[PDB]
Each structure stands twice: as C-alpha cells, then as structure tokens.
Design a protein around this ligand. Structure first.
Ligand SMILES: Nc1ncnc2c1ncn2[C@@H]1O[C@H](COP(=O)(O)OP(=O)(O)OP(=O)(O)O)[C@@H](O)[C@H]1O
Ligand SMILES: Nc1ncnc2c1ncn2[C@@H]1O[C@H](COP(=O)(O)OP(=O)(O)OP(=O)(O)O)[C@@H](O)[C@H]1O
Ligand SMILES: Nc1ncnc2c1ncn2[C@@H]1O[C@H](COP(=O)(O)OP(=O)(O)OP(=O)(O)O)[C@@H](O)[C@H]1O
Ligand SMILES: [Mg+2]
Ligand SMILES: [Mg+2]
Lengths: 403, 403, 48, 39
C-alpha cells in the first residue's frame, strides 16, 4: 500500500557512538600504563582475534605512518606458515636494514594495554575461459536450478548465491545473490530471468528484487571499536529476491553440484583458538571457473583512501599450486570448508566482488607474485538480513506448504 | 532500530492492473462503433485533456508507425498559436505532399469512441556562464539559506528545491531537491553541505537524505491507461532531506529572491478548459543562469526507445526572444506562473534534469531551431511524497515549536 | 555429437543452445519440414 | 596554402517545392549531392 519511494537505512544516525569512541580513546590514553622493555611473561601472550584487534587499534598511529595496510594472523617465514600469532604489515618494497634510518625501522615486539604482547611481520603487497561439461550445465543445458546457476537482468549477469527463506512475516522462499544486479537509480533493473533477459534470448522469469545492503558501520558489525577515524565503513554486499507465485517450484534442487550435500552454516567466534580458521583448506564451484580449491591466509584487512575514509574486509584467500582461485564473473559463489574426516562440508563465506577485489603478493624469490581474493562472512550477513538457509528437500517442501 | 538495508517500492507488484489493461483494450476493440466520414457535430468536440489523451490512446497504432513522438495541445500555424485543440505529431523532416505515397500521408481529422473528434498537426523535432551580483549571492556570499542556493555532496552539486514539512509522524522540517545527489549504490553520498563538501573547501553541515523516488507506473500517476505497451513508466524525480537537530534554524528564509512572495501550490486538473495552462507565461530563478522567463507549449509528451520501453514527461516549455530558458546545473529550480493582475505568483512545476532533457524544434524558416525544456508536475509529486510547503515565516516558527 | 551423419537436413544457426524446458511453444522448432509436392526433410540446430 | 544558412530558397531546394531542377538535393544509400544539369 506504500507509495513508490525507496527507504534508507536508519542505523547510522546516532551521535552516541561517536561520543563513546571519543571517550574510549580518551580513557585509553589516560591509562597509558608504561612498562620497561623487560621480560614479558608468556601467560599474557595473545590467543584470539580480540587481543590482536585491540592491540592493532591501540598502536594504530605508528603502524600507519609508513604502510599500505595491516592484518592479523600467523607469521610467514621463508614462504611457510609458522604457529606464532602476529600482526602483518604490508609494504611496497622490502630492503636491507642498512639502508634504513632508525625512524623508519619497525620493532619486533608490540605490547598493548593490560600487558598483552605480540610479534610483527613484514610482507610485500600490491593493490592492483574454461571449457567442460559442468560449465555448460550451469549455463542453461541442465534441467534444474541450484547453486552456481546463471541469472541475469537487463544489463548484467550473476551467480545464484543460495536458497533461503525469511524469518518474519509469512516466511516466504527465495534466493540470495549480490546487489550489482539491481542498479535502479539510473535505469529500471528489478526483474530476474534464467538464463537470459527477454531482449537477448529465451528465458524464464524468476522474481523481483526485495532487499539489498552494501555498507555497515563497524560498531554494529564487529561489536567493538577498531579505529580512530570518525568515518569508517565495512563492505557487506547482499540482496534477497523471493520467488514469484507463478513459478514452478518442482524444478529447484538443494544439492551443490560437484561437491555433494552440505551441513549448517558455521559461525566465526572471536574467542576461539586461532588455529580453527587460519590455515584451513576451502573450495568453491563457480560459473566461469568450475571447481577450485585454496587456503585461507588472513582476516580483517584494513585499507585507507585519499579522501580520509577507512574500509575493512573479512577473509583473505590464496589459491594453490600457483593457480588463480577465481575469475571475473564468479562473484556470489559460496566458500566451503572441505571435510577432513567423517562430517559433511560446511560453508563459511561468500565471494564479494568489486573492482579492487584482487591483487598480488610475493612469498618466494624463485617465482613471481601470486594472486589473492577477498571474501565476506556469512553468519553476520544472514543475521543482518534476517534470513535462514535450507539444506534438505523435505524441509523445502515443508516450507512450501507452510507459507 | 531497523538494520542497515534499503527497502524497495511495493506499488508495482499487481497483475490486476495488467489484466485490467487487457480487458479495457479488448472491450474497446469490441466496441469499434464505425461511422462514415460525414458531418461531425460541433457539440462533441474535445474541450479538455482527458478527451485528447483517450483519443490518442485509442488510435495509438497508426500514429506510431511513422513518428518520433506525440503530444496534445493547440495547433501551430505560421509560427503562431491558434485556439483549436489538436494532437501534435513529431517528424524528422517535413516535405511536400507530392513526394508522399497514400500510406505515409496523415489525415487531418481523427475521431475516437463516443464520436469525439479532433485535429492533427505536424511539427519538426529533434531529441538532441553568467556574471552578476545575484549569482554571487546564491553561491555563498549571502547571509541566509533559501530557494536557489547551492548544495553539495562528495561528488556532485545541486540547487535547493523548496522548504517543506512532513505530514505524518512528528511533522519534521526539511527541504526538497533532486535525487542525483544521493547515488549510494557504488559510494557513500548521504550527507549534505553548504556551499562545499569538507574535502573541497569551507562549509556547514545541513542534514542527511531520507526519501527519494524516480519511477512511477502511469496507472497510479494519471489514474487512467494511456498506452498499450505492458511496460510503461513515468519519470518523477524527487528527494526529501530533513534538518539536523544541531542546525541553527534562524538563518532560513521563505522568500524567493528576485521574485518576492508566493502563494499556495496550484493543482492541474484534467477537466478544466484548455486555455488555463496552454499559452501562459512562466519564470524561474536558477543558480547558474539567474532570472529567466518563458512560455508553456505542450503537455504529456511520449517517447519510445529501442528496448521496447515507453516513457512520459509532463510539461514542455520554450524560452522567449530566442533565448535559452535554462542551462546545465539548474536542475531542481521552481517553475512559477507570473502574476497578471493583483494576486501573488504561484508555482506549478519543477525542472527535471537528466541527459535527454532538452533539444531543438523549428517554427519559422527565417531563423534556426530553438531549444526546449522539460518539467515535472508539483502537486502529484507532493501527494506521492506526503509533504507540505511553507510560505510564511510565522508558520515556519510555529512548525518549529510544534515538532 | 560432433560427427557427420548421412541424413539430408537444413541447418539453422542460433547464438545459444538451451534445454527444452526453458522454451515456450512458439520458440521451439519442429523436427520435420515438408514443402510443396510432399517432399520432406529434417531440421538441425547449430551454435554459431 | 594547400590546407549553415537559413532562408526560404534553401528550404525550397531541400524538398518543400513542387518541381525538380538545378540545385535540388539527390541521395544514395550513404551520401548526398546536388543535381548538376538536365542533359
Ligand atoms: N619499513 C620497512 N620497509 C622495508 N623493509 C623493512 C622495513 N622495516 C623493516 N624492514 C625489513 O624487513 C625485514 C623483516 O622481516 P620479517 O620480520 O618478516 O622476518 P622473518 O619473518 O623472520 O623472515 P623472512 O624474511 O624469512 O620472512 C628485515 O630485513 C627488516 O630490515
Ligand atoms: N509523414 C509526413 N512526413 C512529412 N510531412 C508530412 C507527413 N504527412 C504530412 N506531411 C505534410 O505536413 C504538412 C501538414 O502541415 P500542418 O498540418 O501543420 O498544416 P498547417 O498547420 O495548417 O500549416 P503550417 O505549415 O503553416 O503550420 C503538409 O504539407 C503535409 O503534406
Ligand atoms: N530456438 C531454439 N534455441 C535454442 N535451442 C533450441 C531452439 N529450438 C530448439 N532448441 C534445442 O536444440 C536441440 C535440438 O538439437 P538437434 O536437433 O541438433 O539434435 P541432435 O542433432 O539429434 O543432437 P546433438 O545435440 O547431439 O547434435 C534441442 O535440445 C532443442 O530443445
Ligand atoms: Mg616473515
Ligand atoms: Mg502547423
């Protein structure tokens, strides 16, 4: 019954958050708690994401003077992962210690409030087609609709993210994708088709866009403060589209082709041991690349631009055997942990997609640089969007009746 | 308390409108009511916008075969306005009758259902810096904020449209502008400043964007059906921004500089005599052009693109003495009827702004083509956005207390 | 299947080849054509 | 060295008249030209 106007988010309209940030930094600076660079007990060594993040927040001024970015994780030595928690600093060039004045040289140990201490590591960094049967099946040669299929609007293309249902209201069923398909401030793009739009080829009509989100304040997302700049944002892309009432729902499958059956979503906790996420193996199935595997390297990467704005990213992933993890047009695919013994695979993330969503880093002197990819957490996005995931066909039918 | 997600309009989700359109055209075609081309009584000659619009809707197939567009109004003969209602058809070139085959030639009389009849007129048509004290005052050299002032976001600029207040809720006070400033699917633009954004110069913070609208279905806007194409839209640009609670409201004025005091908004009725809008004189005050005057020529202009989509525009205006009515960057200014005797001026429209918002038309062979401008109706936009206009400072203060 | 048959046919070229489930009856092509005199032939679809 | 008008006559020569003669406009699938002479 509402009129034809958009509504804007109301979660970024509180000055109490800014006042709390100012008070927090003021009382942190009041409690400097100086200590001599003496023996540091091993009992207060960091063992979680929270400690590293708060240490990085405390010492955010000296680290940002000569840097391109920072992150947290393990220390990398001679191209292989260690098991020592550390803060990673990214530089354009790595030089010998003899050509550095004392100001530019970085310390090897950092300490924050409460006596907690960690290491420092230096990495070099940069901020700048397949043919098979599976790719053909995903592009319109199959008889069902599921994860990895191609969806389209009047201009662009995309990959179907997941099959979901709403938590409130009438509990309607739909799918989750990326908002790029739905650019409706300059031209109408609000209908979805598979595999092609009407003015390019044959296809079938799926539904209309209902919800989307791009930017969230870090205080809501993480729950804590992670910077001093008043203007901070976190990128969280998403869009939800419900199924039309004329659509034939007997052609929908909940299986991920090329992997099998999956379990429930796995939540990332900021107080678990560090080895439950760093160093694990992951895999994906994408529309323009097929099946690929890789390894997770970093978490909570930070970037700063020339207009005084800070941005954050959640997951950093690197491919295996000098193979790229993903291509362009694969944005919106699931990121799933591989099963090691017994249990079924569980998804943890989603490929974000953008313009600076990739780049190069160097680990060994014998070969060239390698590529890296960014990813967005899934549980927090589902909580913000108020949606739930469906993993079995029996539950799919039960939701179909119960609507 | 809501999360950080946008909401989309829910007014374009009914198939009953499409079924009603199909049934309406079916029963119109069933009632062909043929009549010989004989004597037509003058009692059933059209005298309103409704008759012309329904006649154009009925005969929309033969007119669109060789045309660029159509409109309704008066007949133009030898470069001067007549007083005979007519439908205007736009062509690229005008030729003698000897080089036309019978199929291409257009009739001189059209008749619709019920016996109502009108004329046909042919026009040639095309679809493709000031220094003074007032311009300096409007750009930051004055001591007050009002209509015509410059407002800015992190990329673009614009003109302040009007001072308004909301109808529901707590009845908050703000201003009305165009949505282009608020392109927030690719980068954050949600704060407003006068005269410059922080990363370009000095300025003061005004508020944050709350509402916007671009596209409306013609069935809701006009109330009737005006075409056969299933996919039709009407452009209605607007955006509403409320004042922040830290802003000093003693620096706001309700006077239009260079004109004086204005009255209440004037509503355009589709059953009034045609001479109350066609042929009147109008004026505007704009940020990059100053004070200008012009004449209204047409209404309800229709356009069709290569992707099978139809668009409508409300007002067509032509400048006087071969002078352009407006420049680029003047989008968002008011269009006001000049007072002829006694009463105060009243606004009727707003300059739309876009890319194809201007062009050339030819009237006389002695001179070159002239430019034209498009405009959007105000009363319907206010009804859709649920806002009211303030014209006196006493009422401004009364609303300030009553909030 | 990428190999030549020995059955006379008329070849039609399309931009994309899709499954039969996503096609309305109007767009779908027949498998047999017949002309004047009763002569008949097949229809084949190729991407191009 | 080796390296737009508006009037009644120009309009008559471009298709507003009732006859064909010297100065009239002629065209092909790409370009335009002027009629040279009657021969
Ligand atoms: N600002 C700087 N720019 C460039 N190089 C720097 C800078 N500060 C320190 N370095 C150099 O970076 C190196 C630090 O390497 P790092 O801390 O990663 O050691 P590591 O992990 O034990 O060894 P590896 O090189 O095998 O990974 C030193 O050679 C130091 O001189
Ligand atoms: N499809 C067409 N394309 C170009 N010219 C056309 C077409 N159909 C008709 N015409 C020409 O357009 C003219 C119609 O002019 P119109 O109806 O505007 O007359 P008017 O208003 O009385 O005269 P005026 O030319 O003085 O405005 C005729 O010369 C007719 O031959
Ligand atoms: N307009 C169309 N656009 C796209 N695909 C179409 C169209 N009309 C039919 N098709 C599909 O094209 C296929 C016809 O294939 P074809 O006639 O070449 O079969 P075939 O030669 O026996 O098999 P093969 O695929 O092994 O060469 C069917 O799957 C049909 O659904
Ligand atoms: Mg190292
Ligand atoms: Mg005329």
């Amino acid at each position: 019954n509402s009129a034809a106007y958009f509504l804007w988010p109301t979660s970024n309209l509180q000055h109490c958050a800014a006042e709390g940030r100012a008070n927090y930094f003021g009382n942190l600076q009041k409690g400097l708690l100086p200590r001599h660079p003496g023996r540091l007990p091993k009992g207060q060594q960091a063992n979680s994401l929270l400690d590293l993040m708060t240490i990085r927040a405390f010492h955010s001024k000296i680290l940002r003077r000569f840097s391109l970015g920072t992150a947290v994780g393990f220390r990398i030595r001679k191209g292989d992962l260690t098991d020592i928690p550390a803060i990673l600093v990214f530089v354009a060039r790595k030089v010998h210690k003899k050509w550095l004045n004392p100001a530019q040289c970085l310390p090897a140990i950092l300490e924050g409030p409460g006596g907690v201490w960690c290491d420092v590591d230096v990495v070099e960094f940069s901020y700048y087609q397949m043919f098979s049967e599976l790719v053909d099946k995903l592009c319109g040669s199959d008889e069902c609709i599921g994860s990895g299929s191609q969806v389209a609007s009047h201009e662009t293309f995309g990959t179907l993210g997941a099959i979901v249902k709403r938590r409130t209201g009438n509990k309607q069923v739909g799918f989750l994708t990326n908002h790029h398909v739905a650019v409706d401030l300059d031209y109408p793009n609000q209908k979805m088709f598979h595999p092609l739009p009407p003015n390019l080829g044959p296809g079938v009509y799926l539904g209309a866009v209902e919800r989307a989100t791009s930017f969230i304040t870090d205080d809501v997302w993480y729950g804590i403060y992670a910077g001093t700049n008043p203007e901070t944002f976190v990128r969280a892309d998403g869009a939800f589209i419900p199924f039309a009432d004329d659509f034939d729902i007997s052609t929908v499958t909940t299986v991920v082709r090329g992997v099998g059956d999956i379990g429930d979503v796995k939540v990332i906790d900021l107080q678990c041991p560090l080895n439950s996420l760093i160093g694990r193996q992951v895999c994906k199935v994408g529309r323009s690349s097929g099946h690929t595997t890789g390894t997770v390297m970093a978490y909570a990467l930070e970037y700063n631009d020339e207009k005084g704005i800070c941005f954050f990213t959640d997951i950093l992933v690197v491919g295996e055997n000098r193979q790229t993890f993903d291509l362009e047009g694969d944005s919106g695919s699931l990121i799933i942990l591989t099963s090691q013994d017994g249990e079924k695979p569980r998804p943890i993330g989603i490929i974000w997609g953008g313009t600076a969503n990739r780049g190069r880093l160097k680990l060994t002197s014998d070969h060239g640089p390698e590529n890296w990819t960014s990813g967005v957490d899934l549980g927090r996005l589902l909580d913000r969007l108020e949606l739930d995931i469906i993993i079995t066909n029996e539950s799919l039918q039960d939701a179909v009746q119960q609507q």
